[PDB]
A paper describes a structure:
Propionyl-CoA carboxylase ([name]) and 3-methylcrotonyl-CoA carboxylase ([name]) are biotin-dependent carboxylases (BDCs) that catalyze the metabolism of odd-chain fatty acids, cholesterol, and specific amino acids. In contrast, [name] and [name] have their BC, CT, and BCCP domains divided into two chains: the α subunits contain the BC and BCCP domains, with an intermediate BC-CT interaction (BT) domain between them, while the β subunits solely consist of the CT domain. In humans, [name] and [name] catalyze the carboxylation of propionyl-CoA and 3-methylcrotonyl-CoA (MC-CoA), respectively. (**A, B**) The side view (left) and top view (right) of human [name] holoenzyme ([name]-apo) (**A**) and [name] holoenzyme ([name]-apo) (**B**). Both holoenzymes are dodecamers consisting of six α subunits and six β subunits.
We incubated the purified human BDCs with propionyl-CoA ([Fig figs1], D to G), which is the substrate of [name], and determined the cryo-EM structures of the propionyl-CoA-bound [name] and [name] holoenzymes (referred to as [name]-[name] and [name]-[name]), at resolutions of 2.80 Å and 2.36 Å, respectively ([Fig figs2], [Fig figs3], E to H, [Fig figs4], E to H, [Fig figs6] and [Fig figs7], [Table tbls1] and [Fig figs2]). In each [name] holoenzyme, six propionyl-CoA molecules are observed binding to the six active sites of CT domains. Each binding site for propionyl-CoA is formed by the CT-C subdomain of one β subunit and the CT-N subdomain of another β subunit in the other layer ([Fig fig3]). The conformation of the propionyl-CoA binding pocket in the [name]-[name] structure is only slightly different from that in the [name]-apo structure ([Fig fig3]). The AMKM motif in the BCCP domain and the biotin covalently linked to it also show only minor conformational differences in the [name]-[name] structure compared to the [name]-apo structure ([Fig fig3]). The distances between the ureido ring carbonyl oxygen of the biotin and the main chain amide of the catalytic residues G437 and A438 in the corresponding CT domain in the [name]-[name] structure are more than 7 Å, which is too far for an efficient catalytic process ([Fig fig3]). This finding suggests that the biotin may need to relocate to a site that is closer to the catalytic residues to facilitate the carboxylation reaction. The binding mode of propionyl-CoA in our [name]-[name] structure is distinct from that in the ScPCC β subunit structure, but similar to that in the MePCC holoenzyme structure ([Fig fig3]). But the [name]-[name] structure shows that D440, which corresponds to D422 in the β subunit of ScPCC, is not directly involved in the interaction with propionyl-CoA or acetyl-CoA ([Fig fig3]).
Author numbering:
A (entry chain F): 33 to 539
B (entry chain E): 547 to 728
C (entry chain H): 361 to 539
D (entry chain D): 33 to 180
E (entry chain C): 547 to 637
């Protein structure tokens, strides 16, 4: 047997991975293999595989038997491009030892993590694992620690995207907590530390796999997964589209792409969206879609914390991040869940030089013991902090309500904002007329007559604007034109801040 | 200038284009402003300026002047295109995506658009209907009132009302059934 | 309390404290005895994954001296969360009662020998070899195994020589904590 | 057998290294052992040994033999002071596999190299080796590259 | 200020002092300007200012005034000391 024959035999096995029968089962379950997923994700022919001939060095439990060694050791690693842009990937292969993590497994992932940080290219992981490989014991625990160290080091340096394409258990479930975005596949992917078998054995509770850690749970209730997609093919198609929004590294400006949508057009549809009656809700998404280039908007966590909307869009070709209230849900109030999603999004966009647009319509905070005992104070500070420390352009437009401390939390001008616009329907006050007048004229006669005078003078955006809180009051139809003008001149903005080893977020 | 971008040299686009119940084999190539498209062996030349932002896209297909509108697009290949007044649904996958997509399980969920539930806790202040009333898509059915607002619940189904489960003056929570349609 | 398990509330308090001390150059001492994470739907639906990442992040990004001593249990992913050496730690000591493993003998042996006869006999051999701090120490996970009475002396020695420690990290506008 | 007994037995073997008969030959040739050399070099009582319980993982050509395991894997590493000034040291032990370099051997030396660079303290090496440990093959070549 | 230096707390110096053909057991301790030295059981007190650069070192040993010269020193313990005119080699 020549060396070339041995090489060819290893190449053929590396492509089969766990073997054709396991691949057959992989498809029966409705899943693609790790290599098929990469072929879909990356530009055709752009993928270059690294370390395809690496095998484990294990010896206990008869794991050093021939029928036990596989080339690639359960991960496919390499580099490629999406639409001409460099990206690093890795994908875990469930058909080889259940996708469990070995020492060598982690080493290969770390290698990719180090090349991407050095050059400044994003890393996209496709995760699917049964947890640690117990045959090696403590070697796999060091594997996790090294991966975690790279994921922390890369934070704020390169984007880190993690798409879950199957179950994930043990220590593996923490890597999506360190990356920027986590995506899942409905009814296929899971995230949990221990399985239902442990829950039943430890405590008298009955739960199944989908209930414990299914995609629907994490995208609707726990707030862990940013979005779930119907199947593997649609998940990767949307991932390519998402990729096109982000810079390659934090040293780069927000990408600018060819755009055919005139930057100076008006949107007459905005003038009548906001009702004159204060108790009538409207859909904030109608405003967002009409302003953004070609009415394309990428919504994050559509089913979690619906009272606040965050997502990506482009204006005049440039990627921007959008944050705003949704008056339809809980009157547009802030609560614990909305502050968590908001602060996380704002901080990512600031780290990677993506401008922020804020659409404010917030009457205050969600009251009640459910929020008080939940630490609403500690959690609300997260969104205020995320805006106050931002150094990227911030353009705020107030569409209607801004009462109380929520005015400042939703990126008010006095938090180093660049511009602040009000629509004619905006009203900025410490509280509404009823509270303010009954408190001011407490115990006085003819309070209702005093309220009429108070409403005429203060129930409008003018007592704030004349003091410098608002830069202009614009016809809503011109909102897009005004924002476009600001974005194209604030893009060269640079500011300094006192040196600090690191930031200290309230947590 | 830090990270050179290299445009993939794609000479031919091999697509699998699914219409109503048929899947067609289409291969396209770009020659500038005109795409040469082979549709199941038929050669067509589609010339345009391809301004992708305009609501009205004017194309010339083998000398035939057409106006089309693209109403929606999805990353998964779904496109809604209005052609001669009628909206057609087309799912365009690449050859590779179409070949692998056959391995996906055809799971089907239930359409429960007749079951109208409260999206938000509060007091019911208006119901626009009684059983037998006609309902249009987007029609207001119930109004709830919490934190002195008027959350409006609309129907997602055309038909008539079968039962009204919550009346004005009643207090409802999240997920409670308000009205049931036929 | 709760067998020493990690949960949402403990991760929040821990991460906040660790981050402050790192920012103001205050060394960290870690006393590890953690069997894993608090199970149950109360924690799963509460975002235990998202919240546990807060404590791991706070330790991993630290640049101040970190001295860890393991007094007894360190099972599973909790080993790394509680400032393990592979997160740029300075020293890691074990007491003779420490045990470092992916899981306890019962889970590990029944999974390894799943469907086999005489599992209990195999468990006896497994416990004798792995139910101790040695399979981790011989691989470089632990720097020494010390008599507990000397813990103070060892820590004092490390603190007075790690105080001049300086490290570099790649430049980043700001950190991006998992939240 | 308790864990404390096993620990004490490993401590006693780590101090003997290659064994008393090897040590006897070491003196016959007119050489000190690696641990005796450190005791002379550093301020009395200042030396703290690191990773004394680390053993090789290599299994091949009968290396997996318990009779083939030596705690310390042929190097003594640690830190101390000379006249009150911090210094890092390591010393290669010729009595254990001829002082040959293994993967784990290099790893321990690299660990000292990294702590010394981070704090800013000199490193003094006491070298004595027969070369690469051929039983591991290419693992020892990576060891050299990391040290370099 | 970057690297604190900690003076070893050496209470006693245990020396093996080889002269011509004899090896003597000497234990010394410092009490400031005077060293208390036990030489094979004999107690001596050597008081001086210990200016180590001068060619002439004046010492007082149990009240006896001596002048000595240190001519050479080696790291290996060898010292050449002139005592009453004669150079003695001590290791
Ligand atoms: C706690 C600290 C850590 O981070 S270490 C935690 C390790 N504990 C675990 O995750 C236990 C492993 N199993 C599970 O968690 C769940 O039952 C999983 C496997 C995720 C559910 O997936 P499910 O679709 O049921 O797969 P399965 O159980 O049929 O396994 C598929 C094939 O993979 C294998 N496999 C799985 N896990 C491991 C593992 N840890 N070590 C070695 N092999 C593993 C299974 O044996 C199976 O292979 P086969 O089909 O039997 O030929
Ligand atoms: C009705 O008269 C009172 C409504 C309750 C007050 C509302 S609830 C949400 C806003 N936040 C706040 O502190 N008060 C407002
Ligand atoms: C009894 O046999 C089972 C106890 C339950 C498992 C415990 S609960 C806390 C630890 N974390 C974990 O994932 N498992 C351990």
């Amino acid at each position: 047997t020549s060396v070339n024959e041995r090489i060819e035999n290893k190449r053929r096995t590396a492509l089969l991975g766990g073997g054709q029968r396991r691949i057959d089962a992989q498809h029966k379950r409705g899943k693609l293999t790790a290599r098929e997923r990469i072929s879909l994700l990356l530009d055709p022919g752009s993928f270059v595989e690294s370390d395809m001939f690496v095998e484990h060095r294990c010896a206990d439990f008869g794991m050093a038997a021939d029928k036990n060694k596989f080339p690639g050791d359960s991960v496919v690693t390499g580099r490629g491009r999406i639409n001409g842009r460099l990206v690093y990937v890795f994908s875990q292969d469930f058909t080889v030892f259940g996708g469990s993590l070995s020492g060598a497994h982690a080493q290969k992932i770390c290698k990719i993590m180090d090349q991407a940080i050095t050059v400044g290219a994003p890393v996209i992981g496709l995760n699917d694992s049964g947890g640690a490989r117990i045959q090696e014991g403590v070697e796999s625990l060091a594997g996790y620690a090294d991966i975690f160290l790279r994921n922390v080091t890369a934070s704020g340096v390169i984007p880190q995207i993690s798409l879950i394409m199957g179950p994930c258990a043990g220590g593996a479930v923490y890597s999506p907590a360190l990356t920027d975005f986590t995506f899942m596949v409905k009814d296929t992917s899971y995230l949990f530390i221990t399985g239902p078998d442990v829950v039943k054995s430890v405590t008298n509770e009955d739960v199944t796999q989908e209930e414990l850690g299914g995609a629907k749970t994490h995208t609707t209730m726990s707030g862990v997964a940013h979005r779930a997609f119907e199947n593997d093919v649609d998940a990767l198609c949307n991932l390519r589209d998402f990729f096109n929004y982000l810079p390659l590294s934090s040293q780069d400006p927000a990408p600018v792409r060819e755009c055919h949508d005139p930057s100076d057009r008006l949107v007459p549809e905005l003038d009548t969206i906001v009702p004159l009656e204060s108790t009538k809700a409207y859909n904030m998404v109608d405003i967002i879609h009409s302003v953004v280039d070609e009415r394309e908007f990428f919504e994050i966590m559509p089913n979690y914390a619906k009272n606040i909307i965050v997502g990506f869009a482009r204006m005049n070709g440039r990627t921007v991040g959008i944050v705003g209230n949704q008056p339809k849900v809980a009157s547009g109030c802030l609560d614990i869940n909305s502050s968590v999603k908001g602060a996380r999004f704002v901080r990512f966009c600031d780290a990677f030089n993506i401008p922020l647009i804020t659409f404010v319509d917030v009457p205050g905070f969600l009251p009640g013991t459910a929020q008080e005992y939940g630490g609403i104070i500690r959690h609300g500070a997260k969104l205020l902090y995320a805006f106050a420390e931002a150094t990227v352009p911030k353009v705020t437009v107030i569409t209607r309500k801004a009462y109380g401390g929520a005015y400042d939390v939703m990126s008010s001008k006095h938090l180093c904002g660049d511009t602040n616009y009000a629509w004619p329907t905006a009203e900025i006050a410490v509280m509404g007329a009823k509270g303010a007048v009954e408190i001011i004229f407490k115990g006085h006669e003819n309070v209702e007559a005093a309220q009429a005078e108070y409403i005429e003078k203060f129930a409008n955006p003018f007592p704030a604007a004349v003091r410098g809180f608002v830069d202009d009051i614009i016809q809503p139809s011109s909102t897009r034109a005004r924002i476009c003008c600001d974005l194209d001149v604030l893009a060269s903005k640079k500011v300094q801040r006192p040196w600090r080893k690191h930031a200290n977020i309230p947590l | 200038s830090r990270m050179p971008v290299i445009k993939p040299d794609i000479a031919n686009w091999e697509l699998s284009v699914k219409l109503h119940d048929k899947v067609h084999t289409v291969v396209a190539s770009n020659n500038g402003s005109v795409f040469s498209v082979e549709v199941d062996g038929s050669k067509l030349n589609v010339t345009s300026t391809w301004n992708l932002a305009s609501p009205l896209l004017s194309v010339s297909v083998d000398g035939t002047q057409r106006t089309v509108q693209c109403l929606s697009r999805e990353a998964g290949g779904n496109m809604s295109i209005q052609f001669l007044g009628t909206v057609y649904k087309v799912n365009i996958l690449t050859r590779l995506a179409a070949e692998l997509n056959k391995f996906m399980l055809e799971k089907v969920t239930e359409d429960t658009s007749s079951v109208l539930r409260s999206p938000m806790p509060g007091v019911v202040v208006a119901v626009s209907v009684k059983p037998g009333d006609a309902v249009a898509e987007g029609q207001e059915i119930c109004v709830i009132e919490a934190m002195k607002m008027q959350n409006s619940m609309t129907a997602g189904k055309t038909g008539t009302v079968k039962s009204v489960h919550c009346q004005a003056g009643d207090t409802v929570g999240e997920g409670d059934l308000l009205v049931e349609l036929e």
